[PDB]
């Protein structure tokens, strides 16, 4: 962290830690987790793919969730801390744009000026996201040096916070930056497992045997394993298709099985989950209901008790589905 | 109605009303309604667009559900229906093909053999909800006799129908068709309105002094409205921008009073609520969005509380309101 940092992510440092102490902070922060990123998700209980078996299978469901909803969560979280610390402006950057429309939803809503550094290049490709956070009242300064590009945004973000955390609160968007950004991400992030360990005590009255989820970045695993880390009776398989953060965590922990799932299993859980259960998954889910399937069939009668974390655009990527279909002639 | 339908629509109604007296119905009905509709919506107060004024505004945020979840709604109350009466099919039309695909979802998860009539013009410019009901595992049926549209492959339906209710059950998708139909489908859409009563009972202590809702088709104003129309000491302002089944149905309860909103004040309210709450609201919640506005500032000091129903295609029509925008040079 370059020296200059150091006063600013001091002061982040003993924020958090402070409001992690305020039970009057976690309240408003749910109350905003409840109204503004649709929390909690269902859970729900698959009985025709389990028929036959011993195995109890749950979804936790955040494909219905909106859009953004993730980034929307930690971004609640941070703008409220900002607030706290008596911050009057945000700074944030975004490619895509999902994530500066969720730093200026945020910052309307708690009332803090926002401004968003976004590169030329991506300003261009991006009308929609960019009218939005516009329409919000956010500022949209495009970057024109270097690449033109989120990494120009963002380090140009970076270049005015430094230079401005007295007043404006940084609004980081991955869990990769310097201390204790990694912390505060994980921690607004944490209530899918959290939620998850609620509901499945109250439905089933103990933990699950294994909680599947497909790790590799934006499918917010970390967020799903969280709160099993210390759940040590508790699995945690960690699905991989066919280094980044995700897995950086999820190795030092010590406590996740990597597993790898093929195309046509994914294509078969992905047939078979429409199939049985109505429900439409995105090939990230896929993977990791292919892997619970595979748990299931193999041993019919181990009483086991599992947990898939449902990924997200189910019927967003539900044409290269048809592709790879139309494509294999299965069509 | 057709004296062929007579004897399936009043053993419809018959299982209708048993089904009504069954906590353990309406227990099942709930649990599908929280796990694939993705219900309770939230309720959010809005504080910064009131701030100045006596006026507590509500927003039930039917807008953060996935598209057809209103939908959805009343398929998960009839598929479970069906099954009551120990149907095995389920027979359906669909024009865009979201009914057709909640039909399938709710047919696949209570095994039920599904089949959804559709207007062979619409198979065509239909692809993807046609290629989900059938990953669905129902069955497309495209009609091209006469227009090869929705009142085709409607009429082909109930022609299917009339000659197998015996054991399947006829998916009806608007509210407007023979009893005891309008009935079933109000019921299974007046969640709405009774979470709605419920929320604000919990956080104000009493009901809203008005309830403000965009009427016009498919903005499910009904569906909002039903648990009040009960509770007189509740306004019912049904708005109208610038017959319809919705307004029959209204203004026969006689307590439904209508206003007009203007194209201006619609884009006023929109413009407002995502530069003072965050929130994009689609053009229909506008303008009742709008009303509420007209309402607290005409008298800034009346103490009101007030609900608007938030519509939904926020993101979808967000086009068009650039549009608009541009056109008008605003932008």
Redesign the interface.
Request: charged share 20%; aromatic share 6%; net charge negative.
């Given at each position: 962290v370059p020296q200059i940092l150091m006063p600013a992510l001091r002061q982040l440092e003993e924020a958090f830690v402070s409001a992690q102490k305020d039970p009057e902070f976690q309240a408003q922060f749910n109350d905003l987790l409840?109204?503004?990123a649709?929390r909690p998700t269902?859970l729900?209980k698959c009985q025709?793919i389990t028929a036959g078996t011993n195995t109890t299978l749950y979804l936790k469901?955040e494909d219905?969730l909106?859009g953004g909803a993730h980034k929307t969560n930690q971004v609640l979280g941070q703008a409220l801390l900002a607030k706290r610390m008596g911050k009057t402006e945000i700074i944030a950057e975004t490619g895509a744009g999902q994530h500066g429309v969720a730093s200026?939803?945020?910052?309307?809503?708690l009332?803090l000026k926002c401004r968003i550094y976004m590169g030329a290049k991506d300003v261009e490709r991006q009308?929609?996201n960019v009218?939005?956070m516009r329409?919000?009242?956010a500022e949209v300064i495009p970057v024109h040096s270097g690449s033109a590009t989120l990494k120009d945004a963002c380090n140009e973000a970076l270049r005015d916070w430094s230079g401005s955390y007295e007043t404006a609160h940084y609004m980081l968007g991955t869990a990769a930056g310097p201390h204790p950004y990694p912390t505060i991400v994980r921690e607004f992030q944490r209530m899918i497992g959290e939620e998850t360990k609620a509901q499945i005590l109250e439905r089933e009255g103990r933990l699950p045997d294994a909680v599947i989820a497909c790790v590799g970045g934006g499918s917010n695993a970390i967020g799903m394993f969280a709160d099993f880390i210390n759940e040590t009776n508790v699995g945690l398989i960690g699905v991989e298709p066919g280094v980044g953060p995700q897995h950086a965590y999820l190795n030092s922990t010590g406590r996740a099985d990597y597993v790898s799932i093929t195309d046509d299993e994914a294509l078969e859980a992905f047939?078979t989950l429409?199939?049985?259960?109505?429900?439409?998954p995105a090939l990230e889910s896929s993977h990791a209901l292919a892997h619970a399937l595979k748990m299931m069939r193999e041993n019919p009668d181990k009483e086991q008790l599992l947990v898939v974390n449902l990924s997200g655009r189910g019927?967003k990527d539900?044409?290269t589905v048809?592709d790879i279909l139309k494509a294999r002639g299965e069509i």
């Amino acid at each position: 962290v370059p020296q200059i940092l150091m006063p600013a992510l001091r002061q982040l440092e003993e924020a958090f830690v402070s409001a992690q102490k305020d039970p009057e902070f976690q309240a408003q922060f749910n109350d905003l987790l409840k109204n503004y990123a649709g929390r909690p998700t269902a859970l729900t209980k698959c009985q025709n793919i389990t028929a036959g078996t011993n195995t109890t299978l749950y979804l936790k469901r955040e494909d219905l969730l909106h859009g953004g909803a993730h980034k929307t969560n930690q971004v609640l979280g941070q703008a409220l801390l900002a607030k706290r610390m008596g911050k009057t402006e945000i700074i944030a950057e975004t490619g895509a744009g999902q994530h500066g429309v969720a730093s200026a939803l945020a910052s309307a809503l708690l009332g803090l000026k926002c401004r968003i550094y976004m590169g030329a290049k991506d300003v261009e490709r991006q009308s929609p996201n960019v009218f939005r956070m516009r329409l919000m009242g956010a500022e949209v300064i495009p970057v024109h040096s270097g690449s033109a590009t989120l990494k120009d945004a963002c380090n140009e973000a970076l270049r005015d916070w430094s230079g401005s955390y007295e007043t404006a609160h940084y609004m980081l968007g991955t869990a990769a930056g310097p201390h204790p950004y990694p912390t505060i991400v994980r921690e607004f992030q944490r209530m899918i497992g959290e939620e998850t360990k609620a509901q499945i005590l109250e439905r089933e009255g103990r933990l699950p045997d294994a909680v599947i989820a497909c790790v590799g970045g934006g499918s917010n695993a970390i967020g799903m394993f969280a709160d099993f880390i210390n759940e040590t009776n508790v699995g945690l398989i960690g699905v991989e298709p066919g280094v980044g953060p995700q897995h950086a965590y999820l190795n030092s922990t010590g406590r996740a099985d990597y597993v790898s799932i093929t195309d046509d299993e994914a294509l078969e859980a992905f047939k078979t989950l429409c199939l049985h259960e109505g429900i439409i998954p995105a090939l990230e889910s896929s993977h990791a209901l292919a892997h619970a399937l595979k748990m299931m069939r193999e041993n019919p009668d181990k009483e086991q008790l599992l947990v898939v974390n449902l990924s997200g655009r189910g019927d967003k990527d539900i044409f290269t589905v048809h592709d790879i279909l139309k494509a294999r002639g299965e069509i």
